[PDB]
Amino acid sequence: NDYCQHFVDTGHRPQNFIRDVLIRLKDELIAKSNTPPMYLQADIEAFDIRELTPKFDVILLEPPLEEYYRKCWTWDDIMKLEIDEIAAPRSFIFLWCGSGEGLDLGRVCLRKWGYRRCEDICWIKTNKNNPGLDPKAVFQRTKEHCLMGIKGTVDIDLIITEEPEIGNIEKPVEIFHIIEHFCLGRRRLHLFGRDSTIRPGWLTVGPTLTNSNYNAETYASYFSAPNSYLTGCTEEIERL
Amino acid sequence: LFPPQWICCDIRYLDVSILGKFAVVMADPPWDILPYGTLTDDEMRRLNIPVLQDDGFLFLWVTGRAMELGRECLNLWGYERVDEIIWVKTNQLQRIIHWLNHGKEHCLVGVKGNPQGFNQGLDCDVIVAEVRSTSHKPDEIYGMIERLSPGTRKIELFGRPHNVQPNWITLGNQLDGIHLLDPDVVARFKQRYPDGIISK
Numbered sequence: 001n002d003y004c005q006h007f008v009d010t011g012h013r014p015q016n017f018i019r020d021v022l023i024r025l026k027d028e029l030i031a032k033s034n035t036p037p038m039y040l041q042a043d044i045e046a047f048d049i050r051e052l053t054p055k056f057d058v059i060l061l062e063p064p065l066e067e068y069y070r071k072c073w074t075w076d077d078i079m080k081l082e083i084d085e086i087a088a089p090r091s092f093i094f095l096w097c098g099s100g101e102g103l104d105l106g107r108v109c110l111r112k113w114g115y116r117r118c119e120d121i122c123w124i125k126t127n128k129n130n131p132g133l134d135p136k137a138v139f140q141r142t143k144e145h146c147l148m149g150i151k152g153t154v155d156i157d158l159i160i161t162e163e164p165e166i167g168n169i170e171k172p173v174e175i176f177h178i179i180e181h182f183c184l185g186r187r188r189l190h191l192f193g194r195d196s197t198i199r200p201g202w203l204t205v206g207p208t209l210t211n212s213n214y215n216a217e218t219y220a221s222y223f224s225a226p227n228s229y230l231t232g233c234t235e236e237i238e239r240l
Numbered sequence: 241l242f243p244p245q246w247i248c249c250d251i252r253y254l255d256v257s258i259l260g261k262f263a264v265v266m267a268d269p270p271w272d273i274l275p276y277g278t279l280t281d282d283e284m285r286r287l288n289i290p291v292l293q294d295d296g297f298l299f300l301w302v303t304g305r306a307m308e309l310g311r312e313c314l315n316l317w318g319y320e321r322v323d324e325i326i327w328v329k330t331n332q333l334q335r336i337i338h339w340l341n342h343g344k345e346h347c348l349v350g351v352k353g354n355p356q357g358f359n360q361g362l363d364c365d366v367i368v369a370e371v372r373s374t375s376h377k378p379d380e381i382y383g384m385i386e387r388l389s390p391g392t393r394k395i396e397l398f399g400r401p402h403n404v405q406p407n408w409i410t411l412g413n414q415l416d417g418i419h420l421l422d423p424d425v426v427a428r429f430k431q432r433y434p435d436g437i438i439s440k
């Protein structure tokens with residue numbers, strides 16, 4: 001059957017009909033090596049990002065785009081973030097780009113900060129619960145893209161969930177699972193996270209956080225020797 | 241002229257100015273990502289896509305580093321990218337087939353000029369369909385393109401015999417000969433190629 005024609009006939013998106021959408025020990029290893037959650041309220045447009053130390057192995061960047069809303073950040077604002085100043089020489093970025101011009105401007109940003117794109121992770125949104133509009137659009141936009149970039153020398157590239165209710169800007173928590181399963185290292189930064197996204201193993205920095213516990217010296221002590229190079233998927237280093 | 245038409249040719253060398261103007265272009269290029277039929281990045285840049293449309297849409301299949309190179313070509317050829325279709329690949333029971341396994345293929349959607357009378361927003365930007373023979377694009381894309389722009393002339397570059405469709409002219413070097421039915425195209429073809437040969 002043609003699910004595109006079906007969508008035209010019924011308003012049910014084709015992704016509504018995708019079905020079914022030994023790693024547990026590895027999730028347990030991730031959980032064992034996770035640093036305590038750490039978080040900082042900061043107005044990222046006015047904040048010297050260099051105060052965030054040490055340099056990060058993974059950056060998840062989730063700027064609040066205007067298209068998310070039926071303080072917004074333009075790609076002008078995002079491009080001027082000085083991400084290369086806090087990324088480790090070998091490191092990874094995950095940039096939520098939305099569904100419109102961000103698919104191009106987000107790639108400009110990755111190159112500006114010294115990354116090359118190595119994956120395009122698509123969040124496919126179903127409308128099972130409510131079967132059934134940018135002026136440039138040719139098609140109804142039913143997905144968002146998270147670009148993964150790399151700099152320096154188990155999972156699929158799809159996330160499928162029901163489209164959240166209007167005014168809900170949260171991205172699927174599955175993106176954290178994909179990132180952590182890569183075992184890229186333990187210094188993990190989420191820019192534009194919220195109280196609701198704080199997570200063990202992550203430093204969350206955002207303007208709407210209600211509380212902070214970030215201390216640069218304490219944070220760095222989580223990665224001091226013998227722990228400096230752990231992937232975040234290996235067993236803790238024995239002390240005492 | 242509605243029935244399928246095609247031209248076996250090296251698309252690097254065909255004079256596409258004889259084909260007229262099209263509401264929709266689709267290309268599935270042999271990007272250099274070399275294997276037989278591949279075009280270099282420069283050959284891709286130099287394709288005379290700009291003569292093929294005044295106002296309409298371009299559908300450009302991309303993978304790997306052609307996600308970026310295809311954006312470069314689209315812009316060099318005079319298009320703005322305004323959508324990106326993904327085809328989620330499934331088996332006959334609707335289950336999904338370097339850092340991640342790949343469940344999808346990507347098709348950029350570019351616009352040139354300011355098209356009028358198209359039916360934008362009828363379809364969504366996700367295709368869910370079976371891999372019906374490896375390396376083929378899903379037939380669903382022709383349906384979405386026809387609902388978008390019904391009855392208009394369309395041209396496909398780097399297609400194969402299974403791709404020929406009504407309202408479409410298909411170009412590719414594995415098509416069987418030259419089959420042209422539109423009198424405007426037939427006239428300009430004989431004028432340009434009196435002895436049927438397409439060289440240099």
Ligand SMILES: O=C(NC[C@]1(O)CCCN(c2cc(NCc3ccccc3)ncn2)C1)c1ccc(CN2CC3(CCC3)[C@@H]2C2CC2)cc1O
Nearest residue numbers: 250251268269270277301302303345375377398412413414
């Ligand atoms: O099989 C193909 N296409 C027919 C040719 O016949 C095959 C020889 C090349 N080809 C030409 C090449 C040409 N000039 C240059 C030349 C150089 C050297 C010798 C001879 C010619 N002129 C006219 N056709 C065209 C073909 C097969 C696979 C793909 C890959 N996508 C299928 C895909 C859609 C969803 C999955 C994926 C896309 C990226 C996401 C593209 C293709 O295109």
